[PDB]
Assembly symmetry: D2
Homo-oligomer: 114 residues x 4
């Protein structure tokens, strides 16, 4: 039900080997670790969760952009890129969170489908 | 070697049934029709060309954004979105041209891979 | 030293009356309130801080996008847009944090200048 | 009535000395030169036209991104960024055309206001 895709706007490529951490907001408003991984050669991270586990709630996707740029020897602005959203059962069932990265900027969108 | 992908930033979805026209710059600097189609349910348009036909040169991808918004009953700013680039044999062989559409804005990127 | 600018990609306009909260990471690693305000009719928020107060640190600028969209009758995807960055670590700079908002997407950039 | 603003997403700065050419579609469907200039140190290009000259029509703003990147040692993807729009069809408006540039990507938006 959840896929994260990261692209590099400097090289025109997938952003490969980017660390991604997913958190779920707890009852006490803290962020509890949920799923994590590193993007593949396609810039994608699949297999984070299952339909059973991915219940309604507020989730945060944290993308380690700073390490990505530093590994390319490029000085970046942001510490990370964070995407925070509510999962809703009334909407479509599959969520792609995409991010398009530059050193001093990023774009992010959601593609939510059945 | 060429795929076009169009996304809708208002609905969080693929942009389906969007007309896309591809042109190649001729020797006299005019744009000659090359390929065209309409995006699929996934927002993608595959099958535009073949490796044999997609020689080095300057290409233009024109995305009919205005008709897309008008069909949703939404007033848009742009007449269309145009992406103009050089195909280069020294670079990677596969080109994805992606566009993320809003009524008064768009983002576009290239994902160029082997 | 710090300005925030927010634009609306649906209407082609400034995003007016957007709430913005700025935090600074404390020595104990918590986010401390630093400053807040709302965008003006130009989509800009000035006057958040001073060059004396805006010391080195890790700052978070939280833009309350959800409240903004809901008031237009759009049920948006994101809770907020957060921008996290180290500031002033090579001496004072001027920072503009800009965001371009859609219901299911946003772009953000920084314009960083050196006052001399 | 028409301002163009260009930002650099790699450096976090205005995109300075970017060439911009504006065209207007003629009655014979050709693109007629309308006005041109280069972005200033703020990344802005003012003074392209007047409210009298900027009549109804279909306009193209061509931003010469390739030349800009090449001068930074980046071989970019696009030839240029072109923005095509109908202007002033409900009376005069003020238009800001903004672009945020990366070597393989750009974003563009419009801010359209009504002077009253
Ligand atoms: O498959 C995708 C490709 Cl190729 C591109 C984008 C994508 C994502 C963002 Cl944030 C953008 O600004 C643009 Cl222009 C494309 C998204 C997906 Cl899901
Ligand atoms: O003054 C500005 C104007 Cl008009 C536009 C942007 C701006 C900001 C983002 Cl995030 C964009 O994707 C685009 Cl295309 C423009 C920024 C500033 Cl500071």
């Amino acid at each position: 039900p959840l896929m994260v895709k990261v692209l590099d706007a400097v090289r025109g490529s997938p952003a490969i080997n980017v660390a991604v951490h997913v958190f779920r907001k707890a009852a006490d408003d803290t962020w509890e670790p949920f799923a994590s991984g590193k993007t593949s050669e396609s810039g994608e991270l699949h297999g984070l969760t299952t339909e059973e586990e991915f219940v309604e709630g507020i989730y945060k996707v944290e993308i380690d952009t700073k390490s990505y740029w530093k590994a390319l020897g490029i000085s970046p602005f942001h510490e990370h890129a964070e995407v925070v959203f509510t999962a809703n059962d009334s909407g479509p069932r599959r969520y792609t969170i995409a991010a398009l990265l530059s050193p001093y900027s990023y774009s992010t969108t959601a593609v939510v489908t059945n």
